From a paper:
DUSP22 is a small phosphatase containing 184 residues, and the sequence contains a catalytic domain as well as an N-terminal myristoylation site. This enzyme is broadly expressed in different tissues and plays important roles in the regulation of signaling pathways, such as inactivating the T cell receptor (TCR) signaling pathway, activating the JNK signaling pathway, and regulating the phosphorylation of focal adhesion kinase (FAK). The phosphatase domain of DUSP22 consists of five twisted β-sheets and six α-helices, and the structural scaffold is similar to that of DUSP3 (VHR), while DUSP22 does not contain an N-terminal α-helix surrounded by the N-loop.
In the N128A structure, one hydrogen bond was formed between the side chain of S93 and the backbone amide of A128. These results clearly indicated that the N128-D57 interaction anchored the D-loop and stabilized the conformation of the active site. N128A and N128D increased the KM more than 30 times, but the kcat values were different. N128D decreased the kcat by 16 times, while the kcat of N128A only decreased 2.5 times. Disruption of the DPN–triloop interaction by N128A and N128D critically decrease the catalytic efficiency by 100–500 times because it induces conformation changes in the D-loop and perturbs the conformation of the P-loop.
Numbering used by the authors: -1 to 154
The structure:
């Protein structure tokens, strides 16, 4: 459906879900989620036992997510390098959270955005970034992802 069917594993230690999944104690415990990247309107830390990164991004054609790629990748990557599990979520788990995870996958592999989206969809079939985010991801692939891969090498 249009908000998925529960949070889904994308890679080891990396999950995508909707805002309800992100409050579901049964899902968080079963998937051992200890880090949540919340990317939606008025995102704030909610639960105990969880490290949050909150990005107040709207579902709007004007919303810039590229400027949040670096902070998001650092948060996800440092969680995963510690052997812990991160959930990235927005409202529906379809567009905003998916875009950040695509940028992560592109940075830790040699994938362009379309192969990164294929990877997300293998775990979360409803994934579908809005057209504005597709444009940002294509520009990222063309001009920036190579710089981000070098940054990842130098940092970690």
């Amino acid at each position: 459906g249009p908000m998925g069917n529960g949070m889904n594993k994308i890679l080891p230690g990396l999950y995508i879900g909707n805002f309800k999944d992100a409050r579901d104690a049964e899902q968080l415990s079963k998937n051992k989620v200890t880090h949540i990247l919340s990317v939606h309107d008025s995102a704030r830390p909610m639960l105990e036992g969880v490290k949050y990164l909150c990005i107040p991004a709207a579902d709007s054609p004007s919303q810039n997510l590229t400027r949040h790629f670096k902070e998001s990748i650092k948060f996800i990557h440092e969680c995963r390098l510690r052997g812990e599990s991160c959930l990235v979520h927005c409202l529906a788990g379809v567009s905003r959270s998916v875009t950040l995870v695509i940028a992560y996958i592109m940075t830790v592999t040699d994938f362009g955005w379309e192969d990164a989206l294929h990877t997300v969809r293998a775990g979360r079939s409803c994934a579908n970034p809005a057209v504005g985010f597709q444009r940002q991801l294509q520009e990222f692939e063309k001009h920036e992802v190579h710089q981000y891969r070098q940054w990842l090498k130098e940092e970690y």
